[PDB]
Amino acid sequence: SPGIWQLDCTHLEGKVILVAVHVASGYIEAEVIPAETGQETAYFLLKLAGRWPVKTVHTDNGSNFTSTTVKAACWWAGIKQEDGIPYNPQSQGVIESMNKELKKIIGQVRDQAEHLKTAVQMAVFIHNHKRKGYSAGERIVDIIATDIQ
Amino acid sequence: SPGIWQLDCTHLEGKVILVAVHVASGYIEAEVIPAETGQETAYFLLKLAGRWPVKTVHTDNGSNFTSTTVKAACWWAGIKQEDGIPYNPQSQGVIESMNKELKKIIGQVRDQAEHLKTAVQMAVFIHNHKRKGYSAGERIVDIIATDIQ
Amino acid sequence: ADKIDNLD
Amino acid sequence: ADKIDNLD
Ligand SMILES: [Cl-]
Ligand SMILES: [Cl-]
């Protein structure tokens, strides 16, 4: 559980926002890319695994599960690459609700930023610092520190 | 001190690698940019602050301390922007030794990657997971969780 | 441009 | 290209 993440890809403004969610806390990282390719997804996972202890990634779709570039990055970074089948149907709804929340936030900041990527990083910051009370950024640190100890 | 980070900019292959170091743990995040501008530094600080609880950033040089774009991101993200004067001269040497270590790592991986940005993210991963024993990625989580508690 | 990422 | 980031 401390090491499980879920990938999620959503679209805005003709661009793709790729998100990684730490399942147990709801903390996220995200980036904007022109399109969702195995190379872009692989680089994002290499970034994420250098920053947090990523044990398992549930991929967002079957193309990123199949991609040998993605599997190569998961081999390099020591990540178990898994599918994203919602055996718990609660997963589908959690992800959809998170994408709607992020787009809501992006719309609330959108006019402070010329480029979408700035608005998306503002939305990551607001999401991770939101107290719901602890924030997702507090929960992820607590969860992982508890595992380490 | 859980919230204090230091910016650092070093050069390789005619490109610039911008680094943020969490001073109490030595954990780092980094990116490759074509040049070190206040807009690139501001975006990097917005990313960092959405991912960790960044209270203070010691800027890498006077141009980033002066830059109103960097001050604007530090206002947005709630970061105290400070200078990077090494009142403790030990700081100077720690940064220099860190840049020499990262470049060493980057050389060791460089032929596994077509692009420099991949090699730099491999080096961030190796630096943060290295046990010196705990790793920097463990130290940062421990330090911040202890602060939250 | 009056934006955080483009103050112009 | 036989690289992680370009398997070609
Ligand atoms: Cl796409
Ligand atoms: Cl430069």
Question: Does the annotation list B147 as a binding residue?
Answer: no
Which residues span the domain enclosing A104?
Answer: 1-149
CA distance A51 to chain B (A): 7
How many Å apart are CA A37 and CA A68, to the nearest integer? 11
Ligand closest in space to the Cα of B14 = 2
Structural domain count of chain A: 1
How far apart are the CA of D6 and the nearest CA of chain A, in angstroms?
A: 8
State the angle between helix axes of A90-109 and A116-129 in degrees (0 to 180), rounded to the nearest 10: 120
Say how far apart CA B58 and CA B64 lie, in whole Å. Answer: 10
The angle formed by the CA atoms of residues A49, A52 and A58, to the nearest 5 degrees, is: 60
Q: Is there a binding annotation on residue B142?
A: no
B60 appears as a binding residue in the annotation: yes
Residue with tokens 């190569």: A72
Contact yes or no for A27/A17 (Cβ under 8 A): no
Question: Separation of A125 CA from ligand 2 center, angstroms?
Answer: 27
Q: Which residues does A139 contact at the CB level (< 8 Å), separation at least 6?
A: A24, A25, A26, A27
- For residue A125, what is the domain's CATH number? 3.30.420.10
Tally of CB atoms within 10 A around B108: 13
Cα A97-B53-B47 angle, rounded to 5 deg: 65
Chain D residue with CA closest to A39: the answer is D5
B114 alpha carbon – ligand 1 mean position (Å): 23
- Name the closest residue on chain A to residue B78, using Cα atoms: A125
Q: Which of B79, C5, B74 is nearest to A111 (CA)?
A: C5
Q: Which residues of B touch D (CB under 8 A)?
A: 111-115, 118, 122
DSSP H helical ranges for chain B: 38-51, 62-66, 68-77, 90-109, 116-129, 136-148
Cα B105 to middle of ligand 2, angstroms: 22
In chain A, whose CA is at the least distance from the CA of C5?
A113
What residue type is assigned to position B95 of the chain? Answer: I
As a whole number of angstroms, the distance between CA A58 and CA A82 comes to 5
